[PDB]
Structure formats: structure tokens, C-alpha cells
Amino acid sequence: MTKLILIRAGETEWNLLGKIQGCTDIELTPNGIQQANEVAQQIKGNFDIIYSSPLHRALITAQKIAGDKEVHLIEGMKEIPFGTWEGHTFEELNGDINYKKFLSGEDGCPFDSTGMSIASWSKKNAQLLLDLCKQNENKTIVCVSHGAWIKTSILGLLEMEPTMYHKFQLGNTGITTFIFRHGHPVLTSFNSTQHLL
């Protein structure tokens, strides 16, 4: 009954460049809008309620999916801040100490100098998503958000070590779904992208 659907925002120019957006409010590419429409077509109108991050790339994606429904903004669902890392590619971060930890597992995998980590964001976002699911018990919930945000959410809900973050790759408009088999969540799909051409 209670079904959770996590959808990554559509494509942006910074995505194509490998440029870390984080909180930077970059707009969709024309292809990123096509992606939003194709994922909107896949979902049809199935969900009961749809939430979104307020960032444009996410919000526009959610509005295509929503069709006639309201899109409920959730600031908490905004992309994880990458701080100083924002504006750079990962290749440029090679001489960063916190990036060396981010990969290794040290200090729960720090996001630059944001004071926060894969470990903290996992607990935090998981707790958010669980509260939403309680709020909408026995409904199908769609949440449109971002790559880091969604990946930490997955680790959080499933209770996975922070270094598992680097073993999941999540695409633009990638569908990731949970159900709750006991009281705990169960992953039913991850990064389903068959709706794209």
C-alpha cells in the first residue's frame, strides 16, 4: 500500500559537463525537459501526492509528472550542498583532503567543508522520508529530488555504510522505488530509466 517513488531531476548543462551543482539553481536543458515529459508519461498519473525540491531542475520535472495535481514544495528535499566543490568536476578535486575521505569512508565521507557528510545526510533524509510516509500512510508518494540527496536517502532507509554511495549510479529522471515489507523499507527498483530514448 504505502509506496515511495524517488525521481531524480532532469538533465542540465552542468550535468553534461560533470560540474557539481549542489545547491546552485541550474536550469534544465531542452533534452532535460524531454526527459521530464517521458518520465511523466511513464508514471501516467499513478501517485496520490507529489512532492518536490524547490530547485528548478527538480520542480519543473515534478510539474510535468504532476500534470493536473499540485506539486508540494519541501525545502528539506533540496539538493545536498557541496560547498566549495560546487562549480568543479570531481577530477579537479584530486588534491582535496576531504575528497580523499569522501571516497575512503573517513569521518562518514565529508561533503567538502559543509560540515556534513554522506553519513549525516543519510540519517537526516531517511528520517524525512519516513515522516512523509507516516503522513501519507497507504498512499503512493512521488518525490522529485536530486542525485546525492536520493543516494543518501537510499543508504539511510536501507541502513547502509556511507561508502556504498559510490557503488550506486543514478541517472536523470531515474526512478527508484520503496515499499515497507515489515515496518522497514524494501527497495523494489533503482534507477529505472527504460522510459528514455
Place this chain on the structure above:
Amino acid sequence: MTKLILIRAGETEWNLLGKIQGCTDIELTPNGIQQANEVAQQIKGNFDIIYSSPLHRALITAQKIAGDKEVHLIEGMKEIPFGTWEGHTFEELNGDINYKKFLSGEDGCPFDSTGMSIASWSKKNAQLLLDLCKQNENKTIVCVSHGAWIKTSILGLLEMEPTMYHKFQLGNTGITTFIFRHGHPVLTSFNSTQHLL
């Protein structure tokens, strides 16, 4: 680049009952065959080599997908034996000590009285798939196999605790994909089933 595609076999009557097949060679339902067509239609022959479990439910699904190509049998790809538990639902196993261990984590989560577990199958199936990937370095490899076999493969490739098995739910003709970034495997999709009508 090396791409791995793990596909679960089509539906059977034992699947609809929640009945544990394991090694028993149950045939597809007419719907299971319709699923096999649909997944074959999605894949569109878009792979370089295809391997399969020799059990009919898997092999027939591989044959639909393969179309023109040869389906390479691998005995090691056959569904994990469930021994004692084969021919039963999970609800029937309530009084089994090994089933309580299978859930909890004890002894690497034993599969009945087979002398084997989620832990041992994880290492073993991980190992097999890596050898297959080495043999076909830089090709797109399809492997048709079964629920438990694929889930243990995921845990083994991603190096996860046996108990995580109960947090993944995989469907008939569910697509699951890996690539290899930095030498190590990265999950790009799990249980993608948008091809099903």
C-alpha cells in the same frame, strides 16, 4: 566498456503461490512467457553475449532475449538450492531454526540444510560473474538467472552484509545492471520492470 545485465526468469505457478522453487525445474506460466517476450523486446538484441541458467524458466527467457544469438549455458548460474524449504511458502517455515537465522544474520543466513548461505553464495556468485566479466572485458554481458541467485550476486559484487538480501525485492524479468568504475562494480539499475504491461 564492460556492462553486466542480470535478468530474473519469467513467472511460474510456484511464483504466484509464493512457493519456493529453488532447483526444481518449474515451467513458465503463459504470462511468464508474455513477460519474456516483453523483456526481449526491450533489450532489442542490444548485447554482445548472453549466458543462462539451464533451468527452463530461465533458459526460455534467455532464448526470447537472445533471438538470433547462442545462449551459453552455465550450470553455476542455476538457482540456489533451498533444500528442505523447496516446495513451501515462507509462512510455513515459521518454526525452523535455520529460517530464524536466515532472517537474523546468524551463520551468514543459511539456506535451509544445504550447508550454504547468503554469505557463501554472495562470494561465489560474485566470483563467477567477475570471471565472466574478465573473459568478456569490454562487452555487454547478459545473464539470465533467478531471484536468490541474482540477489546474492548483488550483495557479493557490492560487498554487502547477507541480511541486506531481505531489503531487495526482485521481480520476474526484472533487469539489474552493473558497470565497473575504478575496477570495482557499480550498480546502475536494479529490478527495472517498465517493459511489463
